[model samples]
Structure formats: C-alpha cells, structure tokens
Target chain A: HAFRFHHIGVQTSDLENSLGWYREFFGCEQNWSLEKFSDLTRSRLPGITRLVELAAGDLRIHVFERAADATPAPVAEVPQFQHLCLATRSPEEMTEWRDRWLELYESGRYTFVRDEGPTDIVVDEDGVLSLYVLDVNGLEYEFTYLP
Target chain B: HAFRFHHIGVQTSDLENSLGWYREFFGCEQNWSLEKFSDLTRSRLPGITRLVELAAGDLRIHVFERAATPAPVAEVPQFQHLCLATRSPEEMTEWRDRWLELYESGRYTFVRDEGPTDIVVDEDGVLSLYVLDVNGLEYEFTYLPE
Candidate 1:
C-alpha cells in the first residue's frame, strides 16, 4: 500500500503564472512555498533553489522554477510537455471524463490539447480509454481508464 | 477521488534496457507494450507514439522511448521527476539500503545528498532521497511526517 506519490516535481519558467494557472484551471490550491531548504542547508536544493507546493485533491505538485536551460533529457513515446495520468475506476467514469473534457475543450474554456487536437477521447480494444490535455503552460495531464 | 494517477509517463532512450532495469532493480514488471495504438484503425495516438507500462507495487510507470538528443533543451518541467512516498522512516531506510546496494553494485546513480542513504531533512522536515535511472532521469523517494 505504500509508494503513494509525495509530490510530483514540475518545473516552470514562470512560477507565479504556473501556480495561478493550476489553481484556476485544475482547482488545485497552494499549500506552501520555499526559497531554500534553510540557511543552514548550504547543500544544493536539486535545482529547486525556489519552489511551491500545490494540492490537487489527494496529490501534491512541487513546482520548481529552474534555469532556462535546465529541462531534463527525454524518455519514451513522450509528449513535448511532461505529464501525469489520471486513473478511472471503470468505463462509466472513463466515459464521464471523456465527455467532461470534450465539453471543456470545445467550449474553449481551456487554452489546450498540448497540440491542435487529439480532441476525441480514445477507448482502445483493451478498454483503455485515454485523453491528453494541457495546462495553461502546455504541460500535459492525461485522463485514462484502463480496463 | 477522480485524479488518481493511472500511470506516470517515463521516457527512456531505450525500452528494453529500461524494462530490464526496472525488473532487476525496482522489481517492477512489464505489464504491456504497444507499437501503434492497436493498428489504430488509423488515428493519432498522442506521441504514445509507442510505450511500455511497468507495475511498481501499487503504481504504474508508463515508459516511453523517444530518441536521445545530443543535449537537453531549455524548457520548463512538467514531468520533472517521479516520486515514491513511504509510510515511515524505517521503510525509507530499507528502500535506501537496497538502492545503495545496487549503486555499490555498479548499476545506478544517487542524486542530491552526497551519500546514498543520506537523509535530507529540509527546512520543512521532509525526508528525501533520489536515484537516477539508466537514462539519467530522476526518481525521488520521500517521507514527510505529519
């Protein structure tokens, strides 16, 4: 039952903008902010010279404002922006999410899609339903139901 | 309740190497892999572009194998790093010891703190440890007492 996420680290070129965006669009709220580990902590803070924590329901996102050139190297079938996936318990919930996001996308309420549009929610033969949406800053957050 | 992570996306320069690493070191298994959204009948599949899903305890990591760049470009972090949280300090140490053994065994790298099991107590009292995968991406293991 362990291995729950403590905080998924996110990097922003502009901290205030990213923080505000998460709050407005995702319904997440600020939990805390830090400039350094502490004065006694002369050790490096992992590029996290400054950061903030935002709560998205049960999860927490640690947003880091790193240097302009510090983006991490690549990994698989990766999208341009980094992302987190949402788990749906069943097809009903997955269908619900698909409708909810489609409405949100078409309404133009969100700035979104990470790209022009994979706009339709995809439910594969395995019953895995997926949709990838972006934040105001273009980071991705995937909604999925894996059957 | 609606926002649980189905799988966090992880990119690797090579898939077989990462799948093997997770199996050997983290004890995670390859749950599945797909080349083209199941023949798509022909539609875009996000860069899924091809991926493998690995089970790590209660969580799942969706690994991607995008091509390697000569260097990382200047960009903001969205999926900056992956984190695994534990129940207590003792559990943290056990995981740390196991990782350190692998580090000593010559197949891994530790980030942040100087030593492998060094517990970093931040200003806010959060305990942290880090490890880098075969692709040099970061994995954070943390414990924050309430």
Candidate 2:
C-alpha cells in the first residue's frame, strides 16, 4: 500500500501552555481545535478530551489534551516511540535555531538535554549537524540541518 | 524559520526483525544503515549502536537498535504516535481488513482496547483509523478523499 507522511500525534499535559510554546517557538499556526468527543475520541483517550492541531511548515502535530491529572510515563521507560526531527534548509538556519534554543535555555524557559553548551553540535554519520531539546512535557525533539 | 519533517526515530529491540517487518508491511525501502559510535550516539543512546533508515514514499522512519527495554504502552505521553496518509477510503478499508487478518493469524498485535479499527473524523471531517504495530507503536492511517 502507498502512503505519504501526514502528521505526528503528541500528547501534552498542559495544552494551553504547550500550544503557546509551539506557536511562539516554531512559528506553528493553529490549524483547528476539537472540543467535542466522537467515537474516535472515546475509544482512543481517557476522560474528557480536547485536541488542537498545529502546523509548522510542512509538518503537523496533533496536540491532544486530556484531564489535568493524567500523567504520561517517563520517556526513558518507553523505547518504542522516539523523537521527531525537523529539518532546516542549511547550516546557517540550524545555527539560528540553535541560538534561539540557547536564548530560551538562558531565559530559563527550556533545557538542552544533549548539548550542554550552545555550540556543542551532534554530527551524525552522514555529517548532519543536529541538536536535541526537550519540550515543556519532556518530549524530545531534534533540529537538524539537511538539504 | 522554515523546518521540514526529516524523519521519526524509533528504537527497536531487534533491528533486522523490525526492518524486515516495516519493509514487508509498508513496502518501505532501505535508504542506508549506519553502524558506528559517536559523541551523539553515546550521548543519546547506548555504547554500540546500529541504525537503518527506511523510506516509504515521502515518509522516512529511522529505526535504531539499542539495549533491550520495556515496550511502550498506549497511554504514554511522549511522541505518542505517527500518522500516514493513504490514497483513498477504499485503501483504508483494505488496510483495515489486512490488519484484522494479521491480528487473527497472530502475525501482529492489535490494540483491542481501542477497538480493531477506531475510525475518526478530523477537524476537516477527514476519515482516519488507528492501529498498533508489532512493537506496540501506534500508527494512524488517514484516508484522503480524491
């Protein structure tokens, strides 16, 4: 069967906070929000649910929100699903993103888990430069420069 | 400020098995495989690592092999699931049957708690269904109407 890349679903503990963070940080636009539950909603999630879709460039992330008390397991414990990577046009754009992440880290808003310093870049086997950061809810994200 | 989706990284207990599974199920092509260790590798994963990149149409899934760990549950908070776009509603139906057949034959595990196929309408009223892979990774297939 033929398939194309659509979107990645990310569950957030705080929808409003994460929504604002993604919009402000990544220039993601709020595509839509779902306040009503359907058969899909009832079957997939627990308790009352609200979902907001955010679009960044060609990528889409469906941020799902459940009850405030619902907490997700730590990322370390689960090895099946991993991080999402966003690509930059060139090394210069990646540097800009890295600098922005540094600013956020300095401002005490976010933390850089992989690179302790701003200039510490991870070069993959293909010589692709990238960096990893954690979101508000501790979800990992990779920003890389490829093509 | 522009960012394109590169790929989603998934950790599998067995690289060859998972790679074959993805290739057989989705017709994903093996782009390349890397077997080495670097600062990035050690920092993010275990000591020795092997990574194979697979591509299906425009989608790329970088499957990596690392130390054995517990499989992820459905209710985990992290990068929960990935969605793939199918051509038509009929194809989605075909996928549903195929998945059911696989589940029945004990070829793979289906998330029965979420029903065999949990169909949903998106914000634009697009039809979609969710299914779990052998590793308990949730994958959603959206049927784009032509």
Candidate 3:
C-alpha cells in the first residue's frame, strides 16, 4: 500500500506562535495554508486564520484556531493529546533536533525526561525528546521527535 | 503560508473490523502500523497494539484499544478532538479521498452521535462523521482536508 501517516489536528489559541515553533523545532515545512471565517452554527469550527498544514518527511502537522473562547488543559495533566510526535532518521539525529529546538524556544518551558530505559532507547536522550510550548489559546503541545 | 489539518484519533474495540468500516466510509489509507505490546505501563497506552496510525491526504487517523476493561458508558461520551481545516484544491478530491478508502476496506459501520458539541461549530456537522461500525470503546478524531 502506498500510504503514509499525514498529520494531526491541534487547536491553538495563537496560530502563528505554534506555527513558528513547529517550523523551527522539527524543521517542519508548510504544505498549505488557508483562512476560515464563519459563523455557521452547524459546525464546531469557528472563524479562524492561519490554518496551516505542515510536514517533515512523510509526517504532517496541522494547526489552526477557533473564533470561540474555550480553555484547554496542560500537557502534564493530559499527556496523550498535549504534544504530537515526528520521526527522525536515527537517535543521533534526535540529539541535533533537540538542541535546535531548545535553542529556538529557549525558555524554562522546555525540559528533558531522561529515564526511558534501554532497548527502549529511541530518542538520544532516552526513548524520545519532548518540548512544550503553548499556542495563542494557552493550549500546551508536547512536540516529540524520535531520531 | 501553506498548511493543512491532518487526522484525529479513535479508540476502538476491534481493529480489523473498524479498519474495514473506515476504509469504506472515509476513504482512509493505512499509513503506518505500530504494535506497542510490552511497554504498557510506561507508554500509558490503553490498547494492546497501542498505536495504529492511518491517513487520508494531510489528515491522519489513529486507532487504539482500551487497556482497562471499563463499562460501556465510558465508551460513548466525550469529545475526541477538533480538526484544523485548510482549503483544499477541490471538494471532489476530498470526497475521492474518502471514497477510494471505502473501496479498499470493503465494508462499513453506521455512523453514530457519541459526544457533545463541546467546541462551538462542532454540533452542526463540522466535528462528527459516520463510522461504518462501533462497539464498546469510544472512537474520537478530528479532520479538515484539502
């Protein structure tokens, strides 16, 4: 089958902030962009701008905003949806990826989890390397890169 | 700037069966398959297979089983996710994405209403779609194509 996982949808408070983070950290390239401004009551999507689709190799990442107001939980509280992951060629490459991201988003928000054991050694730090950044809406995203 | 919204995830009771259902209705493609069997505790993944990521154009669909044997009520309620939409070249192309997927899967499950419209536009038909079939576990996902 000529198939590949495309991307994951993430709702953010600020589309531009998240967009910049993803692009700098994963080296994610923008695939397409669009703006949505609507008051259609039937659908949940509110009017939005900076609807962007991004990619790194076969993996894709999409981000946008809802015109409505709603609060989202932190990544630690709900790790499952906090951050999405992308694959790298190797663990060594992840080291390079992690360093670049840390430097780019350089703030107290980025921390490392080093306990993920051997055999499970996927990311250079351990199994994976994760970084957290909030979108304009204050939703947290744990962007993980596995090299 | 160019970017598209990808896929959302769904937690299901049966993988093979749900796979068949999605194939028919959404025109989903089998992107990448993963089996997370041993790392249950650390991963905190609810299912045996842990992760089975699927896709259609820029959207990705993921399926997983629940690790705990919870009651049926747990299976039906809650908003799975919201999709970020970007304009596509054509709606027909978008329809074809899901159509070709149905052809490949060979079967489908009836779509159902499982969650509340937590997000504003979701209730109108923006967030919900038909599932050829569903049992026990709740399937949640979001998508905006093109």
lDDT of 1 by residue, A51-133 (tens): 88888767788877765554332232332224577776776765666565455556654443144443456767677777766
By summed lDDT, which 10 consecutive residues of candidate 1 chain A come out lowest?
Answer: A72-81
List chain A TM-scores, every candidate, in order: 0.64, 0.82, 0.58
Better of 2 and 3 by DockQ: 2
- Tens digit of per-residue lDDT, candidate 2, span B1-146: 48888888888776766776677677889998988767765676754378988998788889987775556765546677788898877778877777676556654443233435756667765888887766777788887665
Q: Which stretches of candidate 3 lie over 4 Å from their true place?
A: A1-8, A29-33, A36-44, A58-60, A74-85, A101-120, A123-147, B1-10, B13-17, B23-36, B40-42, B46-62, B67-146
Could you give candidate 1's per-residue lDDT for residues B53-78 as a string of tens digits?
Answer: 78877777887754444222335445
- Cα deviation at A60, candidate 2, in Å, is 0.7
Candidate 2's clash total is: 0
How well does candidate 3 score on lDDT at residue B127? 36
Q: For residue B112, what is the lDDT in candidate 3?
A: 40
Cα displacement (Å) at residue B119, model 2: 4.1
Please write out the lDDT profile of model 2 over residues A1-147, one tens digit for every residue.
378888888887677777877886788899889888776766767764788899989988889877755565446645566778888888787778777766665676543223445436666667788877666666677888763
Q: Model 1 lDDT vs. the true structure?
A: 0.62
Off by over 4 Å in 2: A68-73, A108-119, A124-126, B105-115, B118-125
Whose lDDT is greatest here?
2
Arrange candidates by TM-score, highest first: which order? 2, 1, 3
* Model 2 lDDT at residue B51: 91
Worst lDDT run of 10 residues, candidate 3 chain A, spans A112-121
